[PDB]
Design a protein around this ligand. Structure first.
Ligand SMILES: NCc1ccccc1
Ligand SMILES: [Ca+2]
Length: 223
């Protein structure tokens, strides 16, 4: 997250870190047994880390649970990032309390102009590299469909939305991939793609979670 702020330990209790020997992506806990992340974050050997603030120090609220199954969306296209969503099943159910909790799935799609909360352990620099230890947050508005299409002509599908700041300076970044965009207490987006981070006229692009709720529900009911 570039241009954001320190969230505060355990204030984003649905945020997870995906670990394959090191943090590599975010995700969102949606059920005691399931995490939603980006399909571009797929890899074998994922450990889900819940209850994290500092990802380099054991602070006492963590739950580390290995993935038992990963399910990339059937229509994921890694070239366009259309349908950039994946479900991860946990080997055992997380214990839910204040510091670890699920986030609700949306009923209705989110509105242009709504301020959402984006969070993660990704790079904090637009130019160069610096990776934080504690969870960072950014409040960012959903942009209009026409603005999003102007920023990325020919590339925005109905399964994507932009959020952020056309002026630059505030954005999600590498390492935030797969993490949550929460609007009015619902998971509306997944950190998906863009062109660099916090550059002028290149806001973040996010998977539009509302379009996937039927697939998520059916998949969790059968796996
Ligand atoms: N600045 C949007 C973004 C986020 C994660 C990965 C690539 C691009
Ligand atoms: Ca920790």
């Amino acid at each position: 997250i570039v241009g954001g702020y320190t969230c505060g330990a355990n204030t984003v209790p649905y945020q997870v870190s995906l670990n394959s020997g090191y943090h590599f992506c975010g995700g969102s806990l949606i059920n005691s047994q399931w995490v939603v992340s980006a399909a571009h974050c797929y890899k074998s050997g994922i450990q889900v880390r819940l209850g994290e603030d500092n990802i380099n120090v054991v602070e006492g609220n963590e739950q580390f649970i290995s993935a038992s199954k990963s399910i990339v969306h059937p229509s994921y296209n890694s070239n366009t990032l259309n349908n950039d969503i994946m479900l991860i099943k946990l080997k055992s159910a997380a214990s839910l309390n204040s510091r670890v909790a699920s986030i609700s799935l949306p009923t209705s799609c989110a509105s242009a102009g709504t301020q959402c909360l984006i969070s993660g352990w990704g790079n904090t620099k637009s130019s160069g590299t610096s990776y934080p230890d504690v969870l960072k947050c950014l409040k960012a508005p959903i942009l209009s469909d026409s603005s999003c299409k102007s920023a990325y002509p020919g590339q925005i599908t109905s399964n994507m939305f932009c959020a952020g700041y056309l002026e630059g300076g505030k954005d999600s970044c590498q390492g935030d991939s797969g993490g949550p965009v929460v609007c009015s207490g619902k998971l509306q987006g997944i950190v998906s793609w863009g062109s660099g981070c916090a550059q002028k006229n290149k806001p973040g692009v996010y998977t539009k979670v509302c379009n996937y709720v039927s697939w998520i529900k059916q998949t969790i009911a059968s796996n």
